[PDB]
């Protein structure tokens, strides 16, 4: 019985919510709040423990970018602080390889990072690895074939359709086939050996289009679009299906939770979050 966790987000200000969705019975659990509110964070799971990485606390009286790493234990309902990253990283992308968390790009005020760092839970340490070829904030990260992909984003001047690949053994990045659409703040995940890029912002409007990367053919193909246009959406894979949580449609902060079935190439609304929000960190455990 695995749950879909949603941490943080934004609705008028950065949020502290930690909530878990049970896709089996349709219930929502209210868990212990994050110690510091945060949006533009990323979530991941290492050894049954949930991690909230980077982000920013936007308050009506002041904004603070986050270098924080926090760990949630589902068994104890407690958040524990971990070692912080070298730099604050808002609109961060995260990926896990061999129980190691990679923190990809993000922003610190005026700085758009191309830098990448790796966390070792066993040692409680961050170390910088090779930086990306492109500075990317609002970047989608996916782990496929023990390689780390950085998809789309914004480099400080331009919204990107470009994507690159990290080889951990060789400690190097290579540019891959670019997407058909420019996407900053897309939901990026792996399902059945493919990378999916859902939604985002093309520099003009929020997108409902979804495309998947096939590694054997090195091509991006459009699949069924979502019912709602969304950027800063949370994304996860649970039991062979993609779940997209909340996001921003250009006016409204969505509470809508859509589910993609690859067998039928269809999206459907499965639930509603307790409240609408964007820039949530999502993981399954
Ligand atoms: C830049 C901006 O506007 N502001 C002004 C104050 C704070 C910030 C804001 O509001 N951010 C939140 C949070 O989103 C995110 O964490 C996020 C996460 C990943 C990628 C992209 C995003 C942005 S999604 C775009 C949407 C927007 O532009 N609004 C509301 C006008 N911003 C939001 O929802
Ligand atoms: Cl933001
Ligand atoms: Na490739």
Curated annotation (Swiss-Prot):
Positions marked as site (Sensor for electrophilic agents): 110
Tissue: Broadly expressed, with highest levels in skeletal muscle.
Effect of residue 9 to C: In a NSCLC cell line; strongly reduces interaction with NFE2L2/NRF2 and reduces repression of NFE2L2/NRF2-dependent gene expression
GO terms of biological process kind: cellular response to interleukin-4; cellular response to oxidative stress; in utero embryonic development; negative regulation of response to oxidative stress; negative regulation of transcription by RNA polymerase II; positive regulation of proteasomal ubiquitin-dependent protein catabolic process; proteasome-mediated ubiquitin-dependent protein catabolic process; protein ubiquitination
Effect on the protein upon substituting residue 58 to A: Loss of interaction with NFE2L2/NRF2. Strongly reduces repression of NFE2L2/NRF2-dependent gene expression. Impaired interaction with SQSTM1/p62
Keywords: Cytoplasm, Host-virus interaction, Kelch repeat, Nucleus, Repeat, S-nitrosylation, Ubl conjugation, Ubl conjugation pathway
Impact after mutating residue 154 to A: Abolishes repression of NFE2L2/NRF2-dependent gene expression
Kelch repeats: 3-48, 49-99, 100-146, 147-193, 194-240, 241-285
GO MF term (any one): ubiquitin-like ligase-substrate adaptor activity
GO CC field: actin filament; centriolar satellite; Cul3-RING ubiquitin ligase complex; cytoplasm; cytosol; endoplasmic reticulum; inclusion body; midbody
Phenotype upon changing residue 40 to C: In a lung adenocarcinoma cell line; also in NSCLC cell lines; strongly reduces interaction with NFE2L2/NRF2 and reduces repression of NFE2L2/NRF2-dependent gene expression
Keyword Cell wall biogenesis/degradation listed: no
Free-text description of this protein's post-translational modifications in UniProt: Non-enzymatic covalent modifications of reactive cysteines by electrophile metabolites inactivate the BCR(KEAP1) complex. Accumulation of fumarate promotes the formation of cysteine S-succination (S-(2-succinyl)cysteine), leading to inactivate the BCR(KEAP1) complex and promote NFE2L2/NRF2 nuclear accumulation and activation. Nitric oxide-dependent 8-Nitro-cGMP formation promotes cysteine guanylation (S-cGMP-cysteine), leading to NFE2L2/NRF2 nuclear accumulation and activation. Degraded via a proteasomal-independent process during selective autophagy: interaction with phosphorylated SQSTM1/p62 sequesters KEAP1 in inclusion bodies, leading to its degradation.
Protein family per UniProt: Belongs to the KEAP1 family.
Role noted for this protein: Substrate-specific adapter of a BCR (BTB-CUL3-RBX1) E3 ubiquitin ligase complex that regulates the response to oxidative stress by targeting NFE2L2/NRF2 for ubiquitination. KEAP1 acts as a key sensor of oxidative and electrophilic stress: in normal conditions, the BCR(KEAP1) complex mediates ubiquitination and degradation of NFE2L2/NRF2, a transcription factor regulating expression of many cytoprotective genes.
Free-text comment on this protein's domains from its UniProt entry: KEAP1 contains reactive cysteine residues that act as sensors for endogenously produced and exogenously encountered small molecules, which react with sulfhydryl groups and modify the cysteine sensors, leading to impair ability of the BCR(KEAP1) complex to ubiquitinate target proteins. The Kelch repeats mediate interaction with NFE2L2/NRF2, BPTF and PGAM5.
Stated name of the protein: Kelch-like ECH-associated protein 1
Name of the gene this protein is made from: KEAP1
